[PDB]
């Protein structure tokens, strides 16, 4: 097995917006170290993913009401191989990051509530490197499973999980999915050898 390189892509992540179980709008490709995802309407900002201007033909009254509460949303930033999330909104955000959950010994599917004003490291490249190393030893099937470890899901305003009426993320009105391109590229250099 040839050792991979911990290089970083130009775009450190991709963000896709959902309402319930439906994709809404196009994918946003983050080229800036620090950015926000908010409920406002600027269309031409490389540092802002504005969800407010996004149309959805099948949107219900509930979803519209929740969108109104996104506000300043979440600030996402990338520093020294680490990704952070800051809740700028006046409502909480809920994050499901297996890489984050691992760091605390939590269930990998854990949904963590980030209240307004709070900051949370939602990814660390080295933790993923450690997991990738364990997978190589455990075989190929274990390595394929690591794809979802490169993904993070985040819900605005409304929580989901065992403690909420909404049991799954596709039952929340406003959520996003993050793909971390660096780990995906690293994963790829392993996958294509095994």
């Amino acid at each position: 097995l040839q050792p991979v390189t911990y290089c970083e892509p130009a775009f450190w992540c991709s963000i896709s917006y959902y309402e319930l179980n439906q994709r809404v709008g196009e994918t946003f490709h983050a080229s800036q170290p620090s950015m926000t995802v908010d409920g406002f309407t600027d269309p031409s900002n490389s540092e802002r993913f504005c969800l407010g201007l996004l149309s959805n033909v099948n949107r219900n009254a509930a979803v519209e009401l929740t969108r109104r509460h996104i506000g300043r949303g979440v600030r996402l930033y990338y520093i020294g191989g680490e990704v952070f999330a800051e809740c700028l909104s006046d409502s909480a955000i809920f994050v499901q990051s297996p890489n984050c959950n691992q760091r605390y010994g939590w269930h990998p599917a854990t949904v963590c509530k980030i209240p307004p004003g709070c900051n949370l490291k939602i990814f660390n490249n080295q933790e993923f490197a450690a997991l990738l190393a364990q997978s190589v030893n455990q075989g190929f099937e274990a390595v394929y499973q690591l794809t979802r470890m490169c993904t993070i899901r985040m819900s605005f305003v409304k929580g989901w999980g065992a403690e909420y009426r909404r049991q799954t993320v596709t039952s929340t009105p406003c959520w996003i999915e993050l793909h971390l391109n660096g780990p995906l590229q690293w994963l790829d250099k392993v996958l294509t050898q095994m």
Binding site: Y104, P108, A109, V111, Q145, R148
Partner: protein, 133 residues
């Protein structure tokens, strides 16, 4: 009753080569807090049927097993899954603390090849303050 009583000889077969998850209790007749959890284990053994087996190993009558896994104090609970030590819980605890321990670690396997099994259910919740800040 549905509780296996292990020995040093039978520990290999009953635990390591067992199907599914096995909860192994390390106890002794002189362990005060060990008697506290003894009725709790019976309730657990009956409520977690089909997904967990409760096993007890008396360390006096069977002194060989405990040091091999680094068991230096009792009560000590080792959760075994397909030959490996999945999780461990030490000291006396309530029925609720035991359920929270079990619910969080009955993941099944033996990952990472079965990591998908952990996302095919309803996810648990934490607050950022649960990290204790």
């Amino acid at each position: 009753d549905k509780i296996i009583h292990l020995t040093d000889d039978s520990f290999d077969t009953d635990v390591l080569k067992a199907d599914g998850a096995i909860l192994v209790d390390f106890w002794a007749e002189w362990c005060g807090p060990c008697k506290m959890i003894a009725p709790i284990l019976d309730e657990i053994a009956d409520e977690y049927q089909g997904k967990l087996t409760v096993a007890k190993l008396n360390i006096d009558q069977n002194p060989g097993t405990a040091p091999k896994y680094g068991i230096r104090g009792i009560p000590t609970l080792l959760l075994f899954k397909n030959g490996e030590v999945a999780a461990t819980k030490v000291g006396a605890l309530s029925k609720g603390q035991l359920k929270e321990f079990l619910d969080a670690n009955l993941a099944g396997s033996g990952l990472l090849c079965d990591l998908d099994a952990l996302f095919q259910g309803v996810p648990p919740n934490k607050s950022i303050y649960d990290v204790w800040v």
